[PDB]
Amino acid sequence: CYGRSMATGKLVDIGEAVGIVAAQSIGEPGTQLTMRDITGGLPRVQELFEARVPRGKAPIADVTGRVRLEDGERFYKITIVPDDGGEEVVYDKISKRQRLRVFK
Amino acid sequence: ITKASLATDSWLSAASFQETTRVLTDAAINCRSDKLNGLKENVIIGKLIPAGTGINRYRNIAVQPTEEARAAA
Amino acid sequence: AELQGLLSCTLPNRDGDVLVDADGKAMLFDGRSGEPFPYPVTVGYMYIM
Amino acid sequence: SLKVPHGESGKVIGIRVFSREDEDELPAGVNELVRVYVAQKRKISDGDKLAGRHGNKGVIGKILPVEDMPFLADGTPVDIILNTHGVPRRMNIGQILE
Amino acid sequence: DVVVAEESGVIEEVSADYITVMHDNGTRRTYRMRKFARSNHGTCANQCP
Amino acid sequence: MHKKVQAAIINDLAERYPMIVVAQTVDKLKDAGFYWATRSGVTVSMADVLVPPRKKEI
Amino acid sequence: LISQRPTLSEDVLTDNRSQFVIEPLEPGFGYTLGNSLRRTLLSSIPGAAVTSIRIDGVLHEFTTVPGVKEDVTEIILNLKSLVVSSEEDEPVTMYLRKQGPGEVTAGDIVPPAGVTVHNPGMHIATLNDKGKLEVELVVERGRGYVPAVQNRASGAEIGRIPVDSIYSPVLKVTYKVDATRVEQRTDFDKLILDVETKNSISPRDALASAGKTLVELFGLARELN
Amino acid sequence: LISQRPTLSEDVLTDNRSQFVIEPLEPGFGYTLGNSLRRTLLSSIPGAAVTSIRIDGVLHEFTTVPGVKEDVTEIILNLKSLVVSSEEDEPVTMYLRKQGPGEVTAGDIVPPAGVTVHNPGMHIATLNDKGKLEVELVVERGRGYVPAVQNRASGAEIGRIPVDSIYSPVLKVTYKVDATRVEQRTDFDKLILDVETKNSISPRDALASAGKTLVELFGLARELNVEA
Amino acid sequence: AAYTLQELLTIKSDDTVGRVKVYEAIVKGENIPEPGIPESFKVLLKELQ
Amino acid sequence: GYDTPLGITNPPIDELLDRVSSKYALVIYAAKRARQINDYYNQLGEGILEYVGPLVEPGLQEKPLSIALREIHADLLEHTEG
Amino acid sequence: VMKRLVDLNHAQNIKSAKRMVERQRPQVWDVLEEVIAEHPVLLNRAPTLHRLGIQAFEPMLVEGKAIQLHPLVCEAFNADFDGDQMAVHLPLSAEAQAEARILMLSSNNILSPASGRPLAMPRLDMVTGLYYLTTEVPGDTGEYQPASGDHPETGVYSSPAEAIMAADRGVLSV
RNA sequence: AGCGAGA
Ligand SMILES: [Mg+2]
Ligand SMILES: [Zn+2]
Known part of the structure; x- marks a missing residue:
């Protein structure tokens, strides 16, 4: 399931500590991992592995449905009528300055 | 990652990691017993890591010549 | 520009021969093999420590 | 007894014997403080660090005999040979100009 | 780190250890060199006229 | 032999051939590379740094 | 075919400097011979x-x-x-x-x-x-x-x-060659070896000592015969 | 008088191919003699x-x-x-x-x-x-x-x-030196020649001829003042 | 590489009893003994106690 | 082709890995064999004991572990994994 | 080395041998060459950002005070020669020596454990030399020309050896 | 304990 050992070039052994190898391989490109508000650098990596709610939390689609975005500066309201379901949900405080991610 | 690490079943490793005082207090209150199965622990107490050349299939290989080799003697 | 101009006039060392051309590079002989290096090489005086 | 620490050697330039017996201002308790000055003349060799004035540093890989050195058409051997690859991307062509 | 004449004059007698200079008005002054004194970082503090 | 092509060659060599051969080949490659870099005639001089003639107009 | 070995004629410029012309040499050989001599003069002159x-x-x-x-x-x-x-x-x-x-x-x-x-x-x-x-x-x-x-x-x-x-007294040794390289292939090399010593021994003596040193090792090589 | 005596051995790889090995040599004579032998083996044997x-x-x-x-x-x-x-x-x-x-x-x-x-x-x-x-x-x-x-x-x-x-009979001569006995002998150099020649003449005899012509060639230099 | 790690952290660094033993084995040419418990783990035990 | 290795890289490891399942197995295998032969040499002065070896003509000054590796190369040993 | 020079009888006993070594007596260099042989050693360069920060080499004696590193492993250490200091460790136990000789040997670790791209690959100088060697320059000396009616192509050669022998002359460019 | 420095 792990797959091929990248270093040895063949299948892994039955005692390899793939965990340490993994972690060190993630960390090695530090520093040379530079940057150019939602983070995008080493802080962003840290956030991803820290499960921290990102600063630029863009809303995501929850249930398939026609959208009824309303206009609120820093507080865009976003209604979505569920295709099958229950009740459309409006998002009281969403940042206007963002730009809606393209869809189909 | 931090929480996952600090939720391990090994107080000697969590203590080695971070925020020593709290982890020891918790483990003490729980009378927690560490089974010494990870790598950091085996390093700390100085016995062989259970990885690579240390696991129980290679660590105790039996090596001997062949009966033909004994005949060569 | 002044460096180029000065480097053009580099009055000869002891006999009539200018070891460094206008570009600032000279032809260097290989000490080991002996054959001259195929291309001229930047040579000069550096103040190192 | 005071012995030369490991990895040291050279000439004994000066020895100073500041003693309480000589009524020197020794700190309370010592009766005789002696300082020996050892000097060594260090010559250049592999591992020593040289550098110009434009951040072009480096340790000495080797010290070749003068014979197997690139020598100009007139027969003057060069003294040093820096690497070209370090100049452009370190962006310090001042040395070249120098 | 370098000895500078305090007042004008003619060098009367100079040696490796000291320089005695005769000033323009009778008086003479002697600067004593510092020979191979150890510096704070183990380097040499030699002075020579 | 761009560095990319060298990398591809060494990758294929390691995939196919045993590691010891890879080491020997890499070492021979280093030797030849140093020798021919010495002969390559790559040096930096002000004259070799050519400014673009159209700079002022731009 | 060359069928003609070289010879070494000396000329003296000053007291402690001189030049030696060696000719005729096989094509593309003077550089090797001059370098060999130079390296001798720069390492092994008692x-x-x-x-x-x-x-x-x-x-x-x-x-x-x-x-x-x-x-x-x-x-x-x-x-x-x-x-x-x-x-x-x-x-x-x-x-x-x-x-x-x-x-x-x-x-x-x-x-x-x-x-x-x-x-x-x-x-x-x-x-x-x-x-x-x-x-x-x-x-x-x-x-x-x-x-x-x-x-x-x-x-x-x-x-x-x-x-x-x-x-060592050898102050400066250099060589230059001017090969004919004709289109009819009657080629040969003339080697001009310029030697400068520090007045301790004339360049003649230094060149002779270098020749002796070399012929020792190559006479070993011949003795393999 | 030389403190160390050079010794010339040879390993034989094929019918005409061989590794000649001359050690030890006053530092640095490996190149001095090696470039000469290579060039002569290539461009002297009739x-x-x-x-x-x-x-x-x-x-x-x-x-x-x-x-x-x-x-x-x-x-x-x-x-x-x-x-x-x-x-x-x-x-x-x-x-x-x-x-x-x-x-x-x-x-x-x-x-x-x-x-x-x-x-x-x-x-x-x-x-x-x-x-x-x-x-x-x-x-x-x-x-x-x-x-x-x-x-x-x-x-x-x-x-x-x-x-x-x-x-020329000799096909390919390639030389390298090494740095034997850094300490006891103060880094003497040893030359490894690799000689590949056609079946016209064996590599050993080709070297013997090369050494002979170098002898005679530097005899010119020695001739000036033999008592040097 | 596990055995070399244990060797390093136990008998090269800390183990006060093994250390003289490995020295003895090296001097006399015997097999390197088995590593013991590093002496820092016990100071930790005493401090926690 | 792998022209003959010279020093610590002789015998070639990739050849050795055929005799075993994993590199770690080779490490332990060679280390135990080397320990065995080193003890054999140490105890040769006293009366003979169960330890035996070497099975390959050793170099005059050659360390036990390289002897063991030379043995391993020629399939002169057997082992059982835990 | 003490053990070996007592075995070789250069010294009578251990303490005499220790005195022999502490003054670096001339006889104790040859024995040193004997002992170091076939004894792997690890070379670490702090920081060890990844697994290839520490590799086992076979040591060899050099004159002066400076660990002579192999250029091709420079990238693996990220160690570049302007005053880096590389620590050396010496395995002792049979297991440790096997581990260093087998798992850690520099020649056994070519491909990165991260992305598998070769890490002993030539670079900087070597890559430039090879680029110069293997590149093609039209209009160079000794080029191929298929012209006929007056002479043959005069670009072909019997064997590579012939090509090198021509390049030695100022005829064929590389 | 405090300073300064190399990578
Ligand atoms: Mg650096
Ligand atoms: Zn699975």
Whole structure:
């Protein structure tokens, strides 16, 4: 399931500590991992592995449905009528300055 | 990652990691017993890591010549 | 520009021969093999420590 | 007894014997403080660090005999040979100009 | 780190250890060199006229 | 032999051939590379740094 | 076919510099031969240099003689530029006494029989009214560069001050070739070897010694036959 | 007097291929002697090789000879790498000829007295459909590698086309030095020569000849003041 | 690489009893003994206690 | 082709890995064999004991572990994994 | 080395041997060459950002005070020669020596454990030399020309050896 | 304990 050992070039052994190898391989490109508000650098990596709610939390689609975005500066309201379901949900405080991610 | 690490079943490793005082207090209150199965622990107490050349299939290989080799003697 | 101009006039060392051309590079002989290096090489005086 | 620490050697330039017996201002308790000055003349060799004035540093890989050195058409051997690859991307062509 | 004449004059007698200079008005002054004194970082503090 | 092509060659060599051969080949490659870099005639001089003639107009 | 071995004709430009023309040589061979000679002249020419000195009123090289204007270290540096030639393997000693004001130059040494100083005007030091510089030097035969031996190497006591020594007189060797490289392939190489020595031995002698050294090794190569 | 005596050994790899190893040598004489041996082995040992050739029916067209499979260039190549030894300095001539289909080999050429071929069983050319081939070789002896000499005469020999001449027997000499006994001996150098030569002469004898010519060559330098 | 790690952290660094033993084994040419418990773990035990 | 290795890289490891399942197995295998032969040499002075070896003509000055590796190369040993 | 020079009888006993070594007596260099042979050593360069920060080499004696590193492993250490200081460790136990000789040997670790791209690949100088060697420059000396009617192509050569021998002459460019 | 420095 792990797959091929990248270093040895063949299948892994039955005692390899793939965990340490993994972690060190993630960390090695530090520093040379530079940057150019939602983070995008080493802080962003840290956030991803820290499960921290990102600063630029863009809303995501929850249930398939026609959208009824309303206009609120820093507080865009976003209604979505569920295709099958229950009740459309409006998002009281969403940042206007963002730009809606393209869809189909 | 931090929480996952600090939720391990090994107080000697969590203590080695971070925020020593709290982890020891918790483990003490729980009378927690560490089974010494990870790598950091085996390093700390100085016995062989259970990885690579240390696991129980290679660590105790039996090596001997062949009966033909004994005949060569 | 002044460096180029000065480097053009580099009055000869002891006999009539200018070891460094206008570009600032000279032809260097290989000490080991002996054959001259195929291309001229930047040579000069550096103040190192 | 005071012995030369490991990895040291050279000439004994000066020895100073500041003693309480000589009524020197020794700190309370010592009766005789002696300082020996050892000097060594260090010559250049592999591992020593040289550098110009434009951040072009480096340790000495080797010290070749003068014979197997690139020598100009007139027969003057060069003294040093820096690497070209370090100049452009370190962006310090001042040395070249120098 | 370098000895500078305090007042004008003619060098009367100079040696490796000291320089005695005769000033323009009778008086003479002697600067004593510092020979191979150890510096704070183990380097040499030699002075020579 | 761009560095990319060298990398591809060494990758294929390691995939196919045993590691010891890879080491020997890499070492021979280093030797030849140093020798021919010495002969390559790559040096930096002000004259070799050519400014673009159209700079002022731009 | 060449069917014609080379020959070496000398011409002399000055007392200590000369040129040697070797011709005819096989095509693309002069560079190799000239480089071989040059490297010989630059490594293995048996020389002779001061190997250890001693000043009467000095115990080590990091001090100063009263009256003398130069440190002992400056004096060793000045001596190290001396050029001498000896005739015997055994270490020889030669003295240098000067008192009172004056310039102590290389012409003031009293070389014993055999050894001689070739540059009397070299400035060793200068003195004043109170200075008294008495130094005995040791000259020894050898080759190449050798670091100064230590006081613990031999029985010399304290006063001995070993000095680095450079046993070689070759000042500068260069060569140039002008190959014909005709279209009819009657090619040959003429090698012009310019040799400059420091007046210790004429370039003729240096070239002869280099030829001897080489023919030894190549005669070994022939003896494989 | 030299404190250490150089010693020349040799490891033998094939019938004509060998690793010569001379140790120890005063530092640095590995290069001093090695570059010389390489160049001399390559460009001093006398030999013989085909200098020019002509083919019947080949006058102005150098693309393909009729009646043969191999075109002009390939036969030029094969003649070029035809090992031969000669004794008479002047350019001798040889005549190869074969009629009918088959496989023409070097062993088929008839040599005059004084010139010998050291590889009769070498494939030169192919004939088919009752074809006939005749080839005339102008061959002398020389040294080194002489590029193709353009014919000085214009019409004297129209058929005789020049070919590059590989006079030297030794094929490939490559040298490297190493740095034995850094401490006890103060880093003496040892030379490893690798010599590959054709079957004309064994590598050892080739070196013996090279060493002899270097002896005589530096005898010029030694001659000036022998008592040095 | 596990055995070399244990060797390093136990008998090269800390183990006060094994250390003289490995020195003895090296001097006399015997097999390197088995590593013991590093002496820092016990100071930790005493401090926690 | 792998022209003959010279020092610590002789015998070639990739050849050795055929005799075993994993590199770690080779490490332990060679280390235990080397320990065995080193003890054999140490105890040769006293009366003979169960330890045996070497099975390959050793170099005059050659360390036990390289002897063991030379043995391993020629399939002169057997082992059982835990 | 003490053990070996007591075995070789250069010293009578251990303490005499220790005295022998503490003054670096001339006889104790040859024995040193004997002992170091076939004894792997690890070379670490702090920081060890990844697994290839520590590799085992076979040590060899060099004159002066400076660990002579192999250039091709420079990238693996990210160690570049302007005053980096590389620590050396010496395995002792049979297991440790096997581990160093087998798992850690520099020649056994070519491909990165991260992305598998070769890490002993030539670079900087070597890559430039090879680029110069293997590149093609039209219009160079000794080029191929298929012209006929007056002479053959005069671009072909019997064997590579012939090509090198021509390049030695000022005829064929590389 | 405090300073300064190399990578
Ligand atoms: Mg650095
Ligand atoms: Zn699975």
